Amino acid sequence: MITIVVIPTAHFSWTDTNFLNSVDYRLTSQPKIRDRFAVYAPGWLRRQLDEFSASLTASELLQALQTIPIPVKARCLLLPKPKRFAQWLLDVPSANIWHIPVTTLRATVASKHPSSDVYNYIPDHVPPSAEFDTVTRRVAAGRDIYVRSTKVLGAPLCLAAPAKYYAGYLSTHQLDGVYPDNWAPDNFHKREFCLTILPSLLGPRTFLLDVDADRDASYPLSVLWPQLRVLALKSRLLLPPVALLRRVVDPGLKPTWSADSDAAFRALRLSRPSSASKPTGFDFSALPVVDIICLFESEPDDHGRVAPGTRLTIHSVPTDLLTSLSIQEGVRYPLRQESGMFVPWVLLALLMSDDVTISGTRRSVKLETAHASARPFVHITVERCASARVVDVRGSPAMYANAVCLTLPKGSYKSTIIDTLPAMFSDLSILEQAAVIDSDALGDSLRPSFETQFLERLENLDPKLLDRAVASILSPASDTSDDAVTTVLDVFNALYREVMTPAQRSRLPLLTQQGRVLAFAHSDYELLSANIPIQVVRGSIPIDHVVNLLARRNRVGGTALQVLLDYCYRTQASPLAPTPAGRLYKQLFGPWLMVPRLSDPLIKLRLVASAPAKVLRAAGWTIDGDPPLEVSCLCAYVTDRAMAAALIERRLDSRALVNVGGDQLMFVEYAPPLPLVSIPRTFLLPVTYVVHWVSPQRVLLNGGNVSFTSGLEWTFDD
Amino acid sequence: VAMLCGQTETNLIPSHHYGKAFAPLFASNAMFTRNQRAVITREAFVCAR
């Protein structure tokens, strides 16, 4: 039984049916494979670590935990307070296994201040005047331990006596927390391998799993990662995840004795034949992704030979994207389109990825996708999957079902993901283009466009000053070059503050108070300066945008105004660490990409909010029928009608403030904001949505504008 | 105050206390990392020069 110690990565899925899947889902592909592994990693230990995390240094914690055997056979047996505890040895006389005198017991019953005497001389009694390691040392003995406090570490903690003594001495939730430990044990089995979150002495039969990704920052033991890694490194004990799939373990890639050419290795062949009629007809919060190594090549030489080329690593591209596009390993696909741009699917892979680096080293690169580079790449081949794991998506980058705004530098390929991707399916409702907000919308709203006005003001300056500014921006070494650039910045700032802010502030409901809005902006400042209650995510894409916009020639400005605007926005943007935009894209579109893999049809839902007919008529509306009108705020999808109905009885504590004008422009607002995590993870939401009457034929004439408040209630539909 | 108020437990054996306290420190190879980094430092320095 070789043991592999595991430290979870950045977004390790925890509520998964099997911890094993979040490690690398390829291990579940074959029965012949999954039968070779045990897991352990019990929940009770997890909870203990969650508590002690705030009270021990990494070195101490590692030193304490490292000695614990794999299946913890011991228990911590909490004792009740002496007045309570003493009665137990007489309620059952044979339970007085230490045979404490009856006189002392009833002397304790008589005393106003019952002493620790009942605890005194009891073997392996742990007083509150004890330390964490004291418990751990006894844990290695396997026998149960008697303690006088709940804050203990290393073994499941359960009551020694019936609850009657601890009641009053402890409170409900405290009395509740020990229940699984009161009947804790479960068996551990002797398979070939056993994974574990519990650390251990690294040695000839213990290995550290290396996934090549950042740890879970929230996971309490991530602080141990450096010390563990270096110790493994100095003794060559790291294991790349692929090594686990081989019949015999070895740290290495491309071994002699194995070609590593088997269906098990090919992560692209994601298959789901088995079923259990479980409520998760699908868990749309769990998303399988892969890290892949891809080889890029340019045109061959005059004699058909080709250069060695370069291979890069793409991180955490969702696998269903590739599978649905029938991408296969070992196939040299064409990279460039007719017009020289990238083929769409490659762009999607880049956009939804987290990062792109050179394969060998750990240097991240922003890829160019234009005619800039000489000997440009024309062919691409995916070679192998460095890792393939499922990841939790629920509410990770964005928090509210209402709306979210993503900031990207000018020249990004947002158009591709918002148009080509849904168009590539165009059969299942993904979003409504009327709900997505292009970052350029407000700039286009002014009667002379914001760009035209900026150009018109700008030309008043001397051309040489403008020329000097543009050159300085392009030339990286031109530090500051204050005169030229600052003058332009002043004009930009003055104009934007003057015109853009009031215009932006005049579109408040359009950004947030629709069904569900996805919005783009060139900088967070564009929203903060206008006080728009929408979460803003500072994204970034792993492609060079500057060169990209240098290829777009059909614009108001001759490619020079564009770079000027780009610099201005970047200067305007607040200094902060930006996140990969792919994560947000994964949160939005990811679940939808798994739809075609499903076996059974979907079921629609919604949470319509009522509307009394009185106010409508009072507002001059002509409406048939007495029953209150209702309006669909947001539609959802499930597939197990049973559990879906079972989950529909919850009453959301979020009111809706519906507002609609005479022009039927309808708006919604949730007084308590609706958070995404509140949505059960079996659901599925569209990227964007537009509120609308459930039955437009009920109304016969729109009176004046209307506002009202109502509750929210998930309901079926037909 | 420190130099005028120092005290210890009555029957103290320094060797036992220090030994019991120093045991966890010298428990791993971590105390040798600096040696390796120094070696690389040397080779890098000479080659650069």
For residues A243 and A23, the answer to whether their CB atoms sit within 8 Å is no
In chain B, residues with a C-beta closer than 8 Å to the C-beta of A230 are 30, 33
Rounded Cα distance between A577 and A71, Å, is 43
Tokens representing A660 are 């609609």
For residues A48 and A181, the answer to whether their CB atoms sit within 8 Å is no
φ/ψ of residue B15, rounded to 5: -60, -50
Q: How near does any CA of chain A get to the CA of B30, in Å?
A: 7
Tokens 């970052």, located at residue: A439
Whether B27 contacts chain A with CB within 8 A = yes
- Comparing CA positions, the residue from B32, B38, B24, B30 lying closest to residue A229 is B30
Q: How many CA atoms lie within 13 A of A141 on its CB side?
A: 11
Number of Cβ within 10 Å of residue A147's Cβ equals 25
The residue of chain A with its CA nearest to that of B24 is: A63
Mark A547-567 as b/e (b = at least 16 C-beta within 10 Å).
bbbbeeeeeeeeebbbbbbbb
How buried is residue A338: exposed, middle or buried, by Cβ count under 10 Å (0-12/13-18/19+)?
Answer: exposed
Beta strand A125-126 pairing with A2-5? unpaired
Mark yes or no for CB contact A235/B30 under 8 Å. Answer: no
Q: Name A658's bridge partners.
A: A708
Rounded Cα distance between A446 and A439, Å, is 14
The residue of chain B with its CA nearest to that of A232 is: B29
SS3 A479: coil
Task: Measure CA A504 to chain center.
Answer: 31
Tokens representing A587 are 């949160």
Rounded Cα distance between A115 and A108, Å, is 7
Tokens representing A464 are 């040489």
How far the first Cα of chain A sits from its last, in Å, is: 55
Whether B24 contacts chain A with CB within 8 A = yes
The residue of chain A with its CA nearest to that of B26 is: A63
A:38-67 residues touching chain B, CB 8 A cutoff: 63
Whether B1 contacts chain A with CB within 8 A = no
Residue A375 is classified by DSSP as: S
Q: How near does any CA of chain B get to the CA of A234, in Å?
A: 8
Rounded Cα distance between A36 and A31, Å, is 9
* Three-state secondary structure readout of A562-617: HHHHHHHHHHHCCCCCCCCHHHHHHHHHHHHHCHHHCCCCCEEEECCEEECHHHHH
Mark yes or no for CB contact B27/A63 under 8 Å. Answer: yes
* Three-state secondary structure readout of A667-706: ECCECCCCEHHHCCCCCCCCCCECCEECCHHHEEECCCCE
Conformational region of residue A686, where left means phi above 0, alpha means psi within -120 to 50, and beta covers everything else: beta
Which stretches of chain B are DSSP H helices?
Answer: 14-22, 33-48
Conformational region of residue A252, where left means phi above 0, alpha means psi within -120 to 50, and beta covers everything else: left
Q: Where are the extended beta strands (E) located within A431-555?
A: 517-521, 535-538
Residue A244 is classified by DSSP as: G
Whether B28 contacts chain A with CB within 8 A = yes
Q: How near does any CA of chain B get to the CA of A191, in Å?
A: 30
A-B C-beta contacts closer than 8 Å: 12
Mark A118-131 as b/e (b = at least 16 C-beta within 10 Å).
bbeeeeebbeeeee
Whether A235 contacts chain B with CB within 8 A = yes
Best mutation site among A230, A236, A237 for testing chain B: the one with the most B CBs within 10 Å? Answer: A230
Beta strand A603-606 pairing with A635-638? antiparallel
How buried is residue A298: exposed, middle or buried, by Cβ count under 10 Å (0-12/13-18/19+)?
Answer: middle
Rounded Cα distance between B25 and A592, Å, is 53
B9 to A605, B3, B5, B14, B21: CA distances (angstroms): 73, 17, 13, 11, 16
In chain B, residues with a C-beta closer than 8 Å to the C-beta of A231 are 28-30
Q: Dihedral angle at the C-alpha atoms of A673, A675, A676, A677, nearest 10 degrees?
A: -170
Residue A497 is classified by DSSP as: I
Q: How was this structure determined?
A: cryo-EM
Beta strand A535-538 pairing with A403-407? parallel
Mark yes or no for CB contact B30/A63 under 8 Å. Answer: no
Q: Name A158's bridge partners.
A: A77
How buried is residue A643: exposed, middle or buried, by Cβ count under 10 Å (0-12/13-18/19+)?
Answer: middle
- Comparing CA positions, the residue from A517, A513, A531 lying closest to residue A657 is A513
Rounded Cα distance between A1 and B32, Å, is 31
Which residue in B24, B27, B29 is closest to A234 by CB distance? B29
- Comparing CA positions, the residue from A314, A329, A270 lying closest to residue A21 is A270
SS3 A312: strand
Rounded Cα distance between A708 and A657, Å, is 6
Which residue in B24, B27, B33 is closest to A230 by CB distance? B33
Number of Cβ within 10 Å of residue A197's Cβ equals 18
Whether A622 contacts chain B with CB within 8 A = no
Task: Measure CA A108 to chain center.
Answer: 56
Resolution of the deposited coordinates, in angstroms? Answer: 3.3
The residue of chain A with its CA nearest to that of B30 is: A231
A149 to A51, A52, A158, A166, A354: CA distances (angstroms): 14, 14, 11, 12, 45
Q: Name A632's bridge partners.
A: A692
CB neighbours of A316 closer than 8 A, spacing ≥ 6? A213, A289, A290, A291, A353, A354, A355, A391, A582, A586
- Comparing CA positions, the residue from A98, A103, A139, A138 lying closest to residue A119 is A98
Rounded Cα distance between A616 and A629, Å, is 9
- Comparing CA positions, the residue from A380, A232, A222 lying closest to residue A311 is A380
Tokens representing A43 are 């929940």
Q: What letter represents residue A295's amino acid? A: L
The residue of chain A with its CA nearest to that of B29 is: A231
- Comparing CA positions, the residue from A58, A364, A13, A404 lying closest to residue A225 is A58
Rounded Cα distance between A250 and A246, Å, is 8
In chain A, residues with a C-beta closer than 8 Å to the C-beta of B28 are 231
- Comparing CA positions, the residue from A320, A196, A223 lying closest to residue A270 is A320
A491 to A112, A459, A663: CA distances (angstroms): 82, 11, 39
Length of chain A: 718
Q: Name A706's bridge partners.
A: A660
Whether A230 contacts chain B with CB within 8 A = yes
Best mutation site among B25, B26, B28, B35 for testing chain A: the one with the most A CBs within 10 Å? Answer: B28
Rounded Cα distance between A204 and A2, Å, is 9
Element (H, E) at A715: none
Which residue in B24, B28, B36 is closest to A231 by CB distance? B28
Residue A79 is classified by DSSP as: P
Give just the sign of the alpha carbon dihedral A27, A30, A33, A38: positive
For residues A410 and A568, the answer to whether their CB atoms sit within 8 Å is no
Tokens representing B6 are 């120092």
In chain A, residues with a C-beta closer than 8 Å to the C-beta of B33 are 230, 234
Question: How does DSSP assign A612-637, residue by residue?
Answer: -HHHHHHTT-EE-SSSPEEEE--EEE
SS3 A199: coil
Triad A294, A295, A296: Cα angle to 5°:
120
Mark yes or no for CB contact A231/B33 under 8 Å. Answer: no
Question: How does DSSP assign A88-151, residue by residue?
Answer: HHHHSGGG-TT---HHHHHHHHH-SS--GGGTTT-TTEE-SS--HHHHHHHHTT-S-EEES-S-
Rounded Cα distance between A335 and A297, Å, is 9
SS3 A412: coil
Whether B33 contacts chain A with CB within 8 A = yes
Q: Dihedral angle at the C-alpha atoms of A508, A509, A513, A515, nearest 10 degrees?
A: -120
Mark yes or no for CB contact A231/B27 under 8 Å. Answer: no
How buried is residue A497: exposed, middle or buried, by Cβ count under 10 Å (0-12/13-18/19+)?
Answer: exposed
Question: How does DSSP assign A140-196, residue by residue?
Answer: TT-S-EEES-S---SS-EEESS-HHHHBTTB-HHHHHHTHHHHT--------SEEEE
Residue A543 is classified by DSSP as: B
Tokens representing A245 are 């799939």
Q: How many CA atoms lie within 13 A of A493 on its CB side?
A: 11
Rounded Cα distance between A610 and A621, Å, is 16
In chain A, residues with a C-beta closer than 8 Å to the C-beta of B29 are 231, 234-235
Rounded Cα distance between A334 and A263, Å, is 25
Q: How near does any CA of chain A get to the CA of B25, in Å?
A: 10
Whether B41 contacts chain A with CB within 8 A = no
Whether B34 contacts chain A with CB within 8 A = no
Tokens 């270096």, located at residue: A230
Q: How near does any CA of chain B get to the CA of A224, in Å?
A: 13
In chain A, residues with a C-beta closer than 8 Å to the C-beta of B24 are 63
In chain A, residues with a C-beta closer than 8 Å to the C-beta of B30 are 227, 230-231
Rounded Cα distance between A394 and A661, Å, is 35
Rounded Cα distance between A18 and A272, Å, is 15
Rounded Cα distance between A291 and A384, Å, is 9
A270 to A36, A318, A333, B19, B26: CA distances (angstroms): 20, 12, 21, 57, 48
Give just the sign of the alpha carbon dihedral A552, A556, A560, A564: negative
For residues A218 and A393, the answer to whether their CB atoms sit within 8 Å is no
Give just the sign of the alpha carbon dihedral A387, A226, A580, A570: negative
Mark A591-618 as b/e (b = at least 16 C-beta within 10 Å).
bbbbbeeeeeeebebbbbbbbebeebee
- Comparing CA positions, the residue from A444, A416, A454 lying closest to residue A503 is A444
Mark yes or no for CB contact A63/B33 under 8 Å. Answer: no
Q: How near does any CA of chain B get to the CA of A60, in Å?
A: 9
For residues A5 and A199, the answer to whether their CB atoms sit within 8 Å is yes
Which stretches of A327-462 are DSSP H helices?
Answer: 344-352, 414-415, 421-425, 441-445, 450-458
In chain A, residues with a C-beta closer than 8 Å to the C-beta of B36 are 234
The residue of chain A with its CA nearest to that of B28 is: A231
Length of chain B: 49
Max CA distance (Å), chain A: 105
Element (H, E) at A508: helix A508-512
